[PDB]
Amino acid sequence: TAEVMSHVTAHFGKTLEECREESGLSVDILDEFKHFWSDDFDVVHRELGCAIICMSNKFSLMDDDVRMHHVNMDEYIKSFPNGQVLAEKMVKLIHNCEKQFDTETDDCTRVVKVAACFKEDSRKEGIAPEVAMVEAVIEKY
Numbered sequence: 001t002a003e004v005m006s007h008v009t010a011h012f013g014k015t016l017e018e019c020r021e022e023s024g025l026s027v028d029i030l031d032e033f034k035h036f037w038s039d040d041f042d043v044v045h046r047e048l049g050c051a052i053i054c055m056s057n058k059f060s061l062m063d064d065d066v067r068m069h070h071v072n073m074d075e076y077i078k079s080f081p082n083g084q085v086l087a088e089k090m091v092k093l094i095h096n097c098e099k100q101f102d103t104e105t106d107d108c109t110r111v112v113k114v115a116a117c118f119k120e121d122s123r124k125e126g127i128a129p130e131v132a133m134v135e136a137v138i139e140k141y
Protein backbone atom coordinates (compact mmCIF):
# COMPACT_ATOMS: atom_id res chain seq x y z
CA THR A 1 0.00 0.00 0.00
CA ALA A 2 0.90 3.65 -0.15
CA GLU A 3 1.27 3.78 3.61
CA VAL A 4 3.77 0.88 3.61
CA MET A 5 5.68 2.50 0.74
CA SER A 6 5.96 5.65 2.81
CA HIS A 7 7.84 3.70 5.47
CA VAL A 8 10.09 1.93 2.89
CA THR A 9 10.92 5.26 1.18
CA ALA A 10 11.61 7.06 4.40
CA HIS A 11 14.31 4.43 5.38
CA PHE A 12 15.76 3.80 1.93
CA GLY A 13 16.23 7.58 1.49
CA LYS A 14 18.63 7.93 4.47
CA THR A 15 21.53 6.75 2.27
CA LEU A 16 21.12 9.61 -0.24
CA GLU A 17 23.87 11.91 1.20
CA GLU A 18 26.55 9.14 1.51
CA CYS A 19 25.85 8.15 -2.09
CA ARG A 20 25.74 11.60 -3.58
CA GLU A 21 29.49 12.12 -4.51
CA GLU A 22 30.08 8.86 -6.30
CA SER A 23 26.81 9.23 -8.24
CA GLY A 24 27.54 12.80 -9.35
CA LEU A 25 24.06 13.74 -8.20
CA SER A 26 23.74 17.49 -7.56
CA VAL A 27 21.58 18.82 -4.72
CA ASP A 28 20.01 20.80 -7.55
CA ILE A 29 18.75 17.58 -9.11
CA LEU A 30 17.41 16.04 -5.88
CA ASP A 31 17.85 17.57 -2.42
CA GLU A 32 15.95 14.93 -0.38
CA PHE A 33 14.96 11.53 -1.56
CA LYS A 34 11.27 11.94 -0.44
CA HIS A 35 10.81 14.33 -3.42
CA PHE A 36 11.24 11.34 -5.70
CA TRP A 37 7.47 10.97 -5.18
CA SER A 38 6.41 14.58 -5.93
CA ASP A 39 3.86 14.74 -8.74
CA ASP A 40 6.09 17.11 -10.62
CA PHE A 41 9.50 15.66 -9.89
CA ASP A 42 10.72 14.16 -13.20
CA VAL A 43 12.70 10.89 -12.69
CA VAL A 44 15.14 11.22 -15.62
CA HIS A 45 18.78 11.85 -14.69
CA ARG A 46 21.38 9.17 -15.16
CA GLU A 47 23.00 10.39 -11.89
CA LEU A 48 19.84 9.58 -9.99
CA GLY A 49 20.09 6.05 -11.52
CA CYS A 50 23.68 5.88 -10.11
CA ALA A 51 22.52 7.07 -6.79
CA ILE A 52 19.74 4.45 -6.68
CA ILE A 53 22.32 1.71 -7.39
CA CYS A 54 24.49 3.04 -4.61
CA MET A 55 21.57 3.22 -2.18
CA SER A 56 20.26 -0.25 -3.12
CA ASN A 57 23.73 -1.77 -2.64
CA LYS A 58 23.62 -0.64 0.96
CA PHE A 59 20.81 -3.14 1.63
CA SER A 60 21.91 -5.78 -0.92
CA LEU A 61 18.83 -5.08 -3.12
CA MET A 62 20.78 -5.63 -6.41
CA ASP A 63 21.71 -8.98 -7.91
CA ASP A 64 25.05 -9.64 -9.72
CA ASP A 65 23.76 -7.98 -12.89
CA VAL A 66 22.47 -4.77 -11.21
CA ARG A 67 18.83 -5.88 -11.38
CA MET A 68 16.57 -6.21 -8.38
CA HIS A 69 17.47 -9.17 -6.08
CA HIS A 70 13.93 -10.45 -5.58
CA VAL A 71 14.48 -12.30 -2.28
CA ASN A 72 16.48 -9.50 -0.65
CA MET A 73 13.92 -6.95 -1.79
CA ASP A 74 11.01 -9.05 -0.36
CA GLU A 75 12.94 -9.43 2.95
CA TYR A 76 13.60 -5.69 3.10
CA ILE A 77 10.00 -4.76 2.41
CA LYS A 78 8.70 -7.22 5.09
CA SER A 79 11.06 -5.63 7.63
CA PHE A 80 8.62 -2.61 7.73
CA PRO A 81 5.21 -2.52 9.52
CA ASN A 82 2.65 -4.51 7.46
CA GLY A 83 5.36 -5.00 4.84
CA GLN A 84 3.88 -8.33 3.77
CA VAL A 85 0.88 -6.61 2.18
CA LEU A 86 3.20 -4.78 -0.33
CA ALA A 87 6.10 -7.21 -0.92
CA GLU A 88 4.61 -9.46 -3.70
CA LYS A 89 3.10 -6.64 -5.70
CA MET A 90 6.12 -4.36 -5.44
CA VAL A 91 8.61 -7.02 -6.74
CA LYS A 92 6.24 -7.95 -9.54
CA LEU A 93 5.77 -4.32 -10.47
CA ILE A 94 9.55 -3.50 -10.43
CA HIS A 95 10.48 -6.67 -12.34
CA ASN A 96 7.86 -5.81 -15.03
CA CYS A 97 9.57 -2.44 -15.48
CA GLU A 98 13.01 -4.08 -15.66
CA LYS A 99 11.88 -6.31 -18.54
CA GLN A 100 10.79 -3.23 -20.56
CA PHE A 101 14.25 -1.71 -20.27
CA ASP A 102 16.38 -4.85 -20.58
CA THR A 103 18.04 -3.50 -23.76
CA GLU A 104 19.52 -0.56 -21.92
CA THR A 105 23.00 -1.95 -20.86
CA ASP A 106 24.14 1.26 -19.15
CA ASP A 107 23.33 0.41 -15.48
CA CYS A 108 22.71 3.98 -14.20
CA THR A 109 20.52 4.81 -17.20
CA ARG A 110 18.63 1.48 -17.06
CA VAL A 111 17.93 1.99 -13.34
CA VAL A 112 16.63 5.56 -13.69
CA LYS A 113 14.32 4.41 -16.52
CA VAL A 114 13.18 1.52 -14.40
CA ALA A 115 12.63 3.97 -11.41
CA ALA A 116 10.42 6.19 -13.58
CA CYS A 117 8.36 3.22 -14.75
CA PHE A 118 8.05 2.00 -11.16
CA LYS A 119 6.82 5.49 -10.09
CA GLU A 120 4.22 5.63 -12.80
CA ASP A 121 3.03 2.04 -12.24
CA SER A 122 3.03 2.58 -8.47
CA ARG A 123 0.49 5.46 -9.00
CA LYS A 124 -1.60 3.36 -11.37
CA GLU A 125 -1.67 0.44 -8.94
CA GLY A 126 -2.20 2.53 -5.79
CA ILE A 127 1.11 2.01 -4.00
CA ALA A 128 2.55 5.54 -4.44
CA PRO A 129 2.76 7.66 -1.29
CA GLU A 130 2.49 11.48 -1.17
CA VAL A 131 5.51 13.37 0.16
CA ALA A 132 3.53 14.21 3.33
CA MET A 133 3.19 10.51 4.21
CA VAL A 134 6.96 10.04 3.77
CA GLU A 135 7.62 13.16 5.92
CA ALA A 136 5.24 11.87 8.66
CA VAL A 137 7.44 8.79 9.10
CA ILE A 138 10.71 10.75 9.02
CA GLU A 139 9.24 13.27 11.52
CA LYS A 140 8.66 10.67 14.29
CA TYR A 141 12.35 10.67 15.18
Ligand SMILES: CCC/C=C\C=C\CCCCCCCCCO
Nearest residue numbers: 008009012052067068114115118
Ligand atom coordinates in the same frame (compact mmCIF):
# COMPACT_ATOMS: atom_id res chain seq x y z
C1 LIG B 1 13.11 0.46 -3.91
C2 LIG B 1 12.89 0.39 -2.42
C3 LIG B 1 12.90 1.82 -1.87
C4 LIG B 1 11.56 2.49 -2.01
C5 LIG B 1 11.37 3.50 -2.85
C6 LIG B 1 12.45 4.00 -3.70
C7 LIG B 1 12.27 4.02 -5.01
C8 LIG B 1 13.34 4.53 -5.94
C9 LIG B 1 13.91 3.41 -6.78
C10 LIG B 1 13.01 2.92 -7.89
C11 LIG B 1 12.99 1.40 -7.96
C12 LIG B 1 14.20 0.81 -7.26
C13 LIG B 1 14.34 -0.69 -7.52
C14 LIG B 1 15.68 -1.02 -8.20
C15 LIG B 1 15.47 -1.08 -9.71
C16 LIG B 1 16.21 -2.29 -10.25
O1 LIG B 1 16.43 -2.24 -11.66
Ligand SMILES: [Mg+2]
Nearest residue numbers: 065066105107
Ligand atom coordinates in the same frame (compact mmCIF):
# COMPACT_ATOMS: atom_id res chain seq x y z
MG1 LIG C 1 25.80 -5.47 -17.01
